[PDB]
């Protein structure tokens, strides 16, 4: 059926315009009677509509809560149609997606959403491509009491955020959680994976998390051990 | 605006129940109300148009209705693909509105969180500034109070909490409440201590380095 396929940068810096493109296949956005949308939805929340273009003519509707920052156009050849939020701050950060209002039949002017494009998570903020540094999460005692224990890494301090962590180059799959990234008041996202493991394995079995950043071509392997109380050792 | 207001903030449902998720609007709305799924990362799905007219291929599970200013989308034999959100949304005109939404997820028994405490590295105690992460482990369901006291009495900021996805294979899942310190703050007290409140357990749990001593 039809597709909408939307492209564009996924930073976009303190006040700058941030440009969006959808991509229409298998349709006409010269076609009568259907309207070309843009909706955002924060982190969690629910969805909010912002604008859209009329198919057959430029004609555009406007969320009044954005009137003066946004402008939405069609691109009549091309089967394009864009946006434009000028003048981004904190509170822009959102996926982005694009979608496609048709009539509903029973009503004149009743235009209900039919179909989306996968959506583009843009964050708005400073920072240039960042590795991250990597610190071992690992109790300071051997837990002995409890028959399983936990160990993890922190993932902090980097921009854009794919980063990827895997244990023992893979073949740790089992326990295994990695939380979502969290952009701190610096501009920069931390993470954590941890696993939980036998505690008889600990001192016989090693464990290693594996980080990339593909962004800024960083790969890390960070080896967790029981805490010293000074300092540790390799 | 008209406000669309859908009542369940979330709820646990096991596969085969009849889920009843609603919405509300804040001014009659005729029958202009759609009604969407939407699984994490994907785009949305329409699912019910008009107030009762189901898209072509939704199964027929989905069951729209209501008129005016109060809606309901009815969930009856609820597959294991039916848990996503699902999110209302009034098309009278500009500006189009939405739903807050509700989380339809998977209910299964009781866990505790198993609670460990992180503390920081000297690598990280180099920088100047450390994180000490408490952890949440494979529990359910999700409200779980994470106090921080340090040394005695409590830290009130400084702690971003995160929170896992249920677990693709037990439903359960996990919270991380990291405390975030200057290094020179961090060295100047002793016990640190998350305690965690959550209801599988019959009282608060507290995990603790002295580090007055490591």
């Known amino acids: 059926q039809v597709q909408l396929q939307e492209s564009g940068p996924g930073v976009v810096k303190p006040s700058e315009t941030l440009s969006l493109t959808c991509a229409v296949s298998?349709?006409?956005?010269?076609?009568?009677?259907?309207?070309w949308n843009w909706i955002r939805q924060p982190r969690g929340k629910g969805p909010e509509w912002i604008g859209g273009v009329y198919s057959s003519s430029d004609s555009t509707a406007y969320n009044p809560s954005l009137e003066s920052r946004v402008s939405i156009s069609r691109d009549t050849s091309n089967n394009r149609f864009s946006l434009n939020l000028r003048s981004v701050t904190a509170t822009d950060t959102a996926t982005y997606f694009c979608?496609?209002?048709?009539?509903?039949?029973?009503?004149?002017?009743?235009?209900?959403?039919?179909?989306w494009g996968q959506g583009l998570l843009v964050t708005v903020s400073s920072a240039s491509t960042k590795g991250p540094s990597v610190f071992p999460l690992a109790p300071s005692s051997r837990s002995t009491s409890e028959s399983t224990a936990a160990l993890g890494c922190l993932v902090k301090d980097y921009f854009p955020e794919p980063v990827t962590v895997s244990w023992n180059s893979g073949s740790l799959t089992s326990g295994v959680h990695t939380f979502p990234a969290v952009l701190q008041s610096s501009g920069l996202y931390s993470l954590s994976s941890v696993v939980t493991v036998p505690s008889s394995s600990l001192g016989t079995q090693t464990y290693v998390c594996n980080v990339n950043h593909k962004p800024s071509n960083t790969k890390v392997d960070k080896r967790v051990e029981i805490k010293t109380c000074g300092g540790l050792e390799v | 605006d008209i406000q669309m207001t859908q009542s369940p903030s979330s709820l646990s449902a096991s596969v085969g129940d009849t889920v009843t998720i609603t919405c509300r609007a804040s001014?009659?709305?005729?029958?202009?109300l759609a009604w969407y799924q939407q699984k994490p990362g994907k785009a949305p799905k329409v699912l019910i148009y008009?107030?009762?007219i189901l898209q072509s291929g939704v199964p027929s599970r989905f069951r729209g209705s209501g008129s005016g200013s109060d809606f309901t989308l009815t969930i009856g034999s609820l597959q294991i693909e039916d848990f996503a959100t699902y999110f209302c949304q009034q098309y009278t005109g500009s500006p189009f509105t939405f739903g807050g939404g509700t989380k339809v997820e998977i209910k299964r028994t009781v866990a505790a969180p198993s609670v460990f405490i992180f503390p920081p590295s000297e690598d990280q105690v180099k920088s100047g500034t450390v994180s000490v992460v408490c952890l949440l482990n494979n529990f359910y369901p999700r409200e779980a109070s994470v106090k921080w006291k340090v040394d005695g009495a409590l830290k009130t900021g400084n702690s971003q909490e995160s929170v896992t996805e249920q677990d693709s294979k037990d439903n359960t899942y996990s919270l991380s409440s990291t405390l975030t310190l200057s290094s020179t703050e961090y060295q100047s007290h002793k016990v640190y201590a998350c305690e965690v409140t959550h209801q599988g357990l019959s009282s608060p749990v507290t995990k603790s380095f002295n580090r007055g001593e490591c």
């Open positions: 979608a496609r209002s048709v009539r509903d039949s029973r009503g004149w002017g009743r235009y209900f959403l039919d179909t």
């Open positions: 298998g349709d006409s956005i010269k076609s009568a009677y259907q309207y």
């Open positions: 008009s107030a009762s």
């Open positions: 001014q009659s709305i005729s029958t202009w």
